[PDB]
Amino acid sequence: DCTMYICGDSTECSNLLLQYGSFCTQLKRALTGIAVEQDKNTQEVFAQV
Amino acid sequence: ETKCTLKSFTVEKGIYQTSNFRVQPTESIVRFPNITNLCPFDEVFNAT
Ligand SMILES: *[C@@H]1O[C@H](CO)[C@@H](O[C@@H]2O[C@H](CO)[C@@H](O)[C@H](O)[C@H]2NC(C)=O)[C@H](O)[C@H]1NC(C)=O
Numbered sequence: 001d002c003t004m005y006i007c008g009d010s011t012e013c014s015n016l017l018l019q020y021g022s023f024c025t026q027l028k029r030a031l032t033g034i035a036v037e038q039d040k041n042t043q044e045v046f047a048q049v
Numbered sequence: 050e051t052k053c054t055l056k057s058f059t060v061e062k063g064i065y066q067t068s069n070f071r072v073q074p075t076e077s078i079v080r081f082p083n084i085t086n087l088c089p090f091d092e093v094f095n096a097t
Pocket residue numbers: 082083084
């Protein structure tokens with residue numbers, strides 16, 4: 001979670017972080033690809049019958 | 050929330066993620082030490 005980890009629990013956190021653009025939503029789109037893949041690996045090894 | 054997280058007006062079937070769950074503070078509180086040390090002002094105001 002980018003907002004809470006970086007400077008969470010601060011009213012001046014989000015607005016200052018907001019002007020940096022689309023950084024943590026870029027990272028968030030990379031740690032969900034890993035999450036989905038780790039479920040597909042088990043579907044190809046054990047689920048062949 | 051999902052619509053504005055995906056920055057679109059149309060979404061497809063499946064599980065997504067959005068902003069997080071949080072609890073706002075109920076109030077605000079501050080800290081005080083114990084009693085006060087005595088300064089010699091009674092003697093000054095009651096000096097003979
Ligand atoms: C700071 O001083 C003492 C330290 O714990 C506390 O006062 C208690 O309550 C009354 C006065 O408020 C005393 O007669 C008690 O003896 C104190 N309790 C104990 C266990 O000693 C309190 O924390 C603070 N009191 C004030 C007035 O600031």
